């Protein structure tokens, strides 16, 4: 990060913590949330802080708070990426990815593929039984850590 | 006497995997299209949003009389 993008951390990290101990309270993130219109349990809270809470002792310091922001902004950039890949593999534009276009794909990608291939990747995808990839079918084949 | 096959059970391994796919699609809908706000979102955009106003009100000054 730059000293701008640390800035932004604390800033965002502030409005949390308001009493100035650099690390946030299951009390703090209970009245941030309360300015919210929602009514977290304390149980609730601090599952909440449990979340993020990496060393587990009972609170978020700024080191944790910036890994998980980190996260939430790689997962923000994961989404915008799989648009841009699903844009680029839906060549005609029709919403949906076709046997035809996943090998163009794959031929692109270096593989070398059979009509029996390509119909069972499409087929393990496919969710609504149509025969050919959606976006949503197409988000979990790229974010599958399987 | 009765087991299932293995081809049984990969149509039973078929039901389930989709029943799990359209659960990962529910809970992706479920995020996006949800009221309850996410504090570090909500957050984030508070201070991004000040920031923002901050270096526009210092921009119109510095384009004032050009
Ligand atoms: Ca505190
Ligand atoms: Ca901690
Ligand atoms: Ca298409
Ligand atoms: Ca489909």
Same mark, same amino acid.
């Given at each position: 990060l730059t000293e701008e993008q640390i800035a932004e951390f604390k800033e965002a990290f502030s409005?949390? =913590?308001?009493? *100035?101990? *650099?690390? &946030?309270?299951?009390?703090? %993130?209970?009245?941030?949330?309360?300015? %919210? *219109?929602? #009514?977290?349990?304390? $149980?609730?809270?601090? @599952?909440? &802080? #449990?979340?993020? @809470?990496? =060393?587990? #002792?009972?609170? &978020? =310091?700024?080191?944790?708070? %910036?890994?998980?922001?980190?996260?939430?902004?790689?997962?923000?950039?994961?989404?915008?990426?799989?648009?841009?890949?699903?844009? /680029?593999?839906?060549?005609?534009? #029709? *919403?949906? &990815?076709? $046997?035809?276009?996943?090998?163009? /794909?794959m031929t692109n990608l270096g593989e070398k593929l059979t009509d029996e291939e390509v119909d069972e990747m499409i087929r393990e995808a496919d969710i609504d039984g149509d025969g050919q990839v959606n976006y949503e079918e197409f988000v979990q084949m790229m974010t599958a850590k399987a | 006497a009765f087991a299932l096959s293995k081809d049984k059970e990969e149509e039973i391994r078929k039901i389930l995997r989709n029943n799990l796919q359209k659960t990962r699609q529910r809970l992706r809908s479920?995020?996006?299209?949800?009221?309850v706000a996410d504090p570090y979102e909500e957050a984030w955009n508070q201070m991004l949003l000040r920031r923002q106003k901050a270096r526009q009100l210092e921009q119109k000054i510095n384009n004032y009389l050009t």
């Open positions: 409005l949390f =913590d308001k009493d *100035g101990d *650099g690390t &946030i309270t299951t009390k703090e %993130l209970g009245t941030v949330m309360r300015s %919210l *219109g929602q #009514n977290p349990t304390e $149980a609730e809270l601090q @599952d909440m &802080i #449990n979340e993020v @809470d990496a =060393d587990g #002792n009972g609170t &978020i =310091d700024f080191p944790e708070f %910036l890994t998980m922001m980190a996260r939430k902004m790689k997962d923000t950039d994961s989404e915008e990426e799989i648009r841009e890949a699903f844009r /680029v593999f839906d060549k005609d534009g #029709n *919403g949906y &990815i076709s $046997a035809a276009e996943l090998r163009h /794909v | 479920y995020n996006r299209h949800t009221l």
